[PDB]
Structure formats: structure tokens, C-alpha cells
Amino acid sequence: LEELREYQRRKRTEYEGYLKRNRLDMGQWIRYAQFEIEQHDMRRARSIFERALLVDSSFIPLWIRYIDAELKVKCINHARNLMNRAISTLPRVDKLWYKYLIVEESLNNVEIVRSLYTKWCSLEPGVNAWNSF
RNA sequence: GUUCGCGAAGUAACCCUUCGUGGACAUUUGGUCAAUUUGAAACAAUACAGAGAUGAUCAGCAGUUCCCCUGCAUAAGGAUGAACCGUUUUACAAAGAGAUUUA
Ligand SMILES: [Mg+2]
Ligand SMILES: [Mg+2]
């Protein structure tokens, strides 16, 4: 376990030291947020992504990946509540809607998307958006 | 304890002493804290590692950090004060070609 313990500890010194110095460079956050996922600890990883939304919330690769780590282990109402916060923050975006729509397809629930497209049409988005509805 | 008044005692031209009493005067200090080993000074010495760039030797001045130290300091010094120079794979598709493959 010390063959493990000191591994995890030494990594969390190196990653934080760099992020300590560079608030930006999201490339590091996602990497380091991925490290804590592969240790099967969701609490730490969620903190990291939540810590990395403060730095920039306009960076969609970060938003998208933090949907993955929720969906991969199948924590539903988190990746569900998250999408409340996700598309209310950046309501214009394209990718964020479709990744919320297409993930609702594989959940087979068409009542959701019925009300989804209600709002997403209420927002008057544009051509390619309406055509999906 | 002082003073006012009263009530008694011995002496008493009513006063001095003595006793018993009513009232007034005066009215809530200090602790965030307990006296040596177990609620946290530091330095020196010893051993190990050695003080930026670059072919090599050097002057430095800044920036960034959930590092500080000497200094009256918003001056200036402290190795250019220190620490940092590592790691990096997905908003991701469009066209075509081969093969497997089912109503
Ligand atoms: Mg310096
Ligand atoms: Mg200096």
C-alpha cells in the first residue's frame, strides 16, 4: 500500500505545484483530474474539475470531459444536475446542447428532449439547431 | 468607626463617663495569564549536496508561487534572495477504397 500511497502522494505534490504556478493551462487540469479518476476516487476528481471551472468556464473541452467521467461510471443525476449548470452558463453553445441531447437518446427518454427542444427552441438558436428538432 | 436622636446607669446646678438601641455617612477588587521535562525560539558543530545563461568566465534587472529573511521603508540588500525550466493524444468529423455482414 505504501508502494501505492507514496505514489499517489508524490503525484499530488507535482501536479498541484505546477497548477499552483499556472492557474491557466487547462491541459494540466484535465490530465491531473484524470489521474484522480483512475484511482477510483470520484470525490477528488470532481473537486479538480470544479476547481478548474473557476479558472475558465468558457473552455468546452473541460466541460465535455467532466461529462464523460460522470457518464463513464454512470453517476446519473450528477451528470444530470450538472447539465442544469452547464447549459444555463453557456446557453448559446452548440456542442453542449447536442452532447446533452444525444446522451438523452441513449437513455431512451424522449419526454426530456421534448422539453429540452422546447427551451432550446425558445432561445431562437438558428438553422442547424432547429433542423435537429 | 464618626455624627444625630432616644432610652437607662454612677457622678451629677443636667455634666462627665458607662451600657442598650433607632437613623445617617461608606457598598462588590482581580484573571484571555497556575511555578522547570509533554503544546512547540534559534544558532553552532558534524556529514552529505554545491552558488543562473554559456563553448567558457562574468554585470545584472524583472515576472510568476497557498516561499520568505535583514531593514524606519513604498529604498536597498539576502546565490541575478529561494522555488520554478518538468508532463503533454477526444468541441473531432467529411469523401473515397477493400473485406466481413443481414431483411
Ligand atoms: Mg531574484
Ligand atoms: Mg534583489
Curated annotation (Swiss-Prot):
Q: What is the designated name of this protein?
A: Pre-mRNA-splicing factor CLF1
Which species is listed as the source?
Saccharomyces cerevisiae (strain ATCC 204508 / S288c) (Baker's yeast)
Protein family per UniProt: Belongs to the crooked-neck family.
Q: Where are the HAT repeats?
A: 6-38, 40-72, 74-106, 108-133
Record's subunit section: Belongs to the NTC complex (or PRP19-associated complex), composed of at least CEF1, CLF1, ISY1, NTC20, SNT309, SYF1, SYF2, and PRP19.
The cellular location(s) given in this protein's UniProt record come to: Nucleus
> What's this chain's function?
Involved in pre-mRNA splicing and cell cycle progression. Required for the spliceosome assembly by promoting the functional integration of the U4/U6.U5 tri-snRNP particle into the U1-, U2-dependent pre-spliceosome. Also recruits PRP19 to the spliceosome, as a component of the NTC complex (or PRP19-associated complex). The association of the NTC complex to the spliceosome mediates conformational rearrangement or stabilizes the structure of the spliceosome after U4 snRNA dissociation, which leads to spliceosome maturation.
Extra notes? Present with 2140 molecules/cell in log phase SD medium.
